[PDB]
Amino acid sequence: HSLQDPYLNTLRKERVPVSIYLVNGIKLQGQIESFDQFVILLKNTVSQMVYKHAISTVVPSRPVR
Amino acid sequence: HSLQDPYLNTLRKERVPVSIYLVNGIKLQGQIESFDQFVILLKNTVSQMVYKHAISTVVPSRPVRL
Amino acid sequence: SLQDPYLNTLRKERVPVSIYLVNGIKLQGQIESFDQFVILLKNTVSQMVYKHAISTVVPSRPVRLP
Amino acid sequence: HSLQDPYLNTLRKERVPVSIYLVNGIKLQGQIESFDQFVILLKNTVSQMVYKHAISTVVPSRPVR
Amino acid sequence: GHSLQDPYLNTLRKERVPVSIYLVNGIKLQGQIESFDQFVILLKNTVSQMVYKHAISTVVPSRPVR
Amino acid sequence: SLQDPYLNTLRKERVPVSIYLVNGIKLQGQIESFDQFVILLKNTVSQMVYKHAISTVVPSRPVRLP
Numbered sequence: 001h002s003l004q005d006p007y008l009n010t011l012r013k014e015r016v017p018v019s020i021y022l023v024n025g026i027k028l029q030g031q032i033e034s035f036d037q038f039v040i041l042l043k044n045t046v047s048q049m050v051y052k053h054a055i056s057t058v059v060p061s062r063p064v065r
Numbered sequence: 066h067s068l069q070d071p072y073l074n075t076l077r078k079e080r081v082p083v084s085i086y087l088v089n090g091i092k093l094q095g096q097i098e099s100f101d102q103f104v105i106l107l108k109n110t111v112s113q114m115v116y117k118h119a120i121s122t123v124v125p126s127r128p129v130r131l
Numbered sequence: 132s133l134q135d136p137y138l139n140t141l142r143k144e145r146v147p148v149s150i151y152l153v154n155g156i157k158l159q160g161q162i163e164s165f166d167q168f169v170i171l172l173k174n175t176v177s178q179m180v181y182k183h184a185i186s187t188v189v190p191s192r193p194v195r196l197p
Numbered sequence: 198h199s200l201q202d203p204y205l206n207t208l209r210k211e212r213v214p215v216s217i218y219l220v221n222g223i224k225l226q227g228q229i230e231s232f233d234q235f236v237i238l239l240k241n242t243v244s245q246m247v248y249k250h251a252i253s254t255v256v257p258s259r260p261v262r
Numbered sequence: 263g264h265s266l267q268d269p270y271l272n273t274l275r276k277e278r279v280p281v282s283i284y285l286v287n288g289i290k291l292q293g294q295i296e297s298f299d300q301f302v303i304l305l306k307n308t309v310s311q312m313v314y315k316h317a318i319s320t321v322v323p324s325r326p327v328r
Numbered sequence: 329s330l331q332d333p334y335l336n337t338l339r340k341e342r343v344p345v346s347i348y349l350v351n352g353i354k355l356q357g358q359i360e361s362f363d364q365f366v367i368l369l370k371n372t373v374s375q376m377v378y379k380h381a382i383s384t385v386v387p388s389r390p391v392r393l394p
Contacts (some may be wrong), residue, residue: 021091
């Protein structure tokens, strides 16, 4: 929405390394390649499709905006 | 959102420290910088975007007046 | 709708309740207010609880059902 | 809801004791007093409102048609 | 939409294929799909229990199906 | 949509993938088919996986992205 999109898009455009924490406790790390209404593609060695419904928090490695 | 929006907006506007408990049991702390229909941006020692679907409760450090 | 009048009765009559979360945690207090997605619980700890994180709402006494 | 509603209504009307297992593993028991799109009211000692999103299964104590 | 799910469940139902339904909490239910709608599946063995799809992780047939 | 073309690439190229569920369980195989709500995973035993129970889809090798 009005916050989530610009936030993720800024992270995407600025290629900021992020830590994505899943609801189960697992921590994912990488950079946001792209995202749509339901998923986020996290890129590194091999990219992976993360369902937003499985995400708890997105923590940037450095301050943004 | 007749209650949620005014509540979160008051916490935000008044810089009220809050504790956000996640469904998995993890406790997040800080002040609400902004929010929308699905996420809340928390800031202080660790700035982060929290998905509401992962939140169980939001406990203000002090009660909120609407 | 049954959820709304049920909650409104608990609210209006200031009935003490126990709100059990999906993670097993038990919250206690009286419902101060609520909307489509959240419930504001108050007494010992004032907090906004997301309904999506609630498993059950158990009143301390029987109440008029809708 | 061509199946859910008739099923729950049958259990409600016939007052069939049921076991409602929650997604977290807890087992609730009693009779279905009523239900709507999102919740089910279960009666035992005091009635409790159960959110369907927290329910995994509804198991009747005896078979029903 | 349901171009895969519906035909899949209906085939399992019509052919009475033994199936295992794994829930998100880890529970494994066994039996056969007797019926289903948009939100639930009726699984039959000892008694027919209603399973909410939201609580299901996977549906695994006892044998391949076409 | 980003999800559909991505899943379709995995499907068409028959790419080996790991599907991690929200409860931490790891499933392996390949995407045989999918619709708006489910994915058909093929390996030693085929199974229908509900997307709501999936946390991440990880291919065994880099693939073309949407």
